[PDB]
Design a binder for this molecule. Structure first.
Ligand SMILES: O=C(NO)c1cccc2ccccc12
Ligand SMILES: [Zn+2]
Length: 225
């Protein structure tokens, strides 16, 4: 399975968001959509909320050409797990996306950016097409944490083909950083693309997933208990 950390499409720029969805996701997607900007979202199953409580956000996200990929169910340190536990950690997210969206993800980003040969083998065995890292960090989860003004200023010097790490669980990333940096990046000539598109893989959203069955209706299996 290939590991990617940089776009290849001239002029592209990938805004990426980990650990979501969260209570600010509708705001964040509204801001992206109003600018025709596409985000890449590496979601959790049970971490900062249960993925099934976010089904409506996920469906809006899915149908608006945003890229949805796995960040594992529980946000585990994957270098610490057995093959089986990692298969389970991925599987649970696949299951939720199958129930809510009808599809399986084909990509993932490891929690903490930590991975090893076992992770890569599990991904290969489960049909994944890539492990997505990044090449610039917003710093929105550093501690102590930079100000929004500092983060925005960092973005003024991130170059073309950046894959930028952000976390949708941070209110200031959603409400201050991203509304400021979308115009900065678009006005200087960058095209705010999903990761697969900026890698020269497909720009068709249907190519980022495997269709499994029709989307389900909410029932009592839509739970993280
Ligand atoms: O999982 C992460 N971002 O989504 C993450 C990526 C890179 C470094 C980290 C350090 C502490 C906690 C999390 C992370
Ligand atoms: Zn994370």
């Amino acid at each position: 399975v290939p590991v990617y950390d940089t776009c290849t499409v001239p002029g592209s720029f990938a805004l990426t968001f980990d650990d979501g969805p969260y209570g600010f996701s509708t705001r964040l997607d509204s801001t992206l959509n109003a600018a025709n900007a596409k985000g890449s979202f590496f979601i959790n199953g049970q971490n900062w909320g249960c993925i099934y409580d976010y089904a409506d956000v996920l469906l809006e996200r899915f149908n608006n050409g945003h890229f949805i990929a796995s960040h594992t169910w529980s946000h585990v340190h994957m270098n610490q797990g057995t093959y089986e536990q990692l298969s389970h950690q991925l599987e649970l997210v696949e299951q939720a996306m199958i129930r809510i969206l009808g599809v399986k993800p084909l990509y993932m980003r490891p929690p903490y950016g930590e991975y090893n040969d076992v992770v890569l083998q599990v991904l290969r065995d489960r049909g994944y097409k890539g492990l997505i890292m990044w090449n610039q960090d917003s710093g929105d989860t550093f501690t102590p944490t930079p100000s929004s003004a500092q983060i925005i200023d960092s973005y003024r010097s991130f170059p073309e083909k950046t894959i930028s790490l952000n976390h949708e669980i941070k209110d200031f990333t959603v409400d201050q950083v991203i509304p400021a940096v979308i115009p900065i990046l678009q006005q200087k000539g960058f095209s705010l693309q999903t990761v697969p598109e900026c890698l020269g893989l497909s720009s068709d959203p249907a190519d980022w997933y495997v269709r499994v069955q029709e989307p389900g209706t909410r029932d009592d299996s839509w739970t993280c208990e």
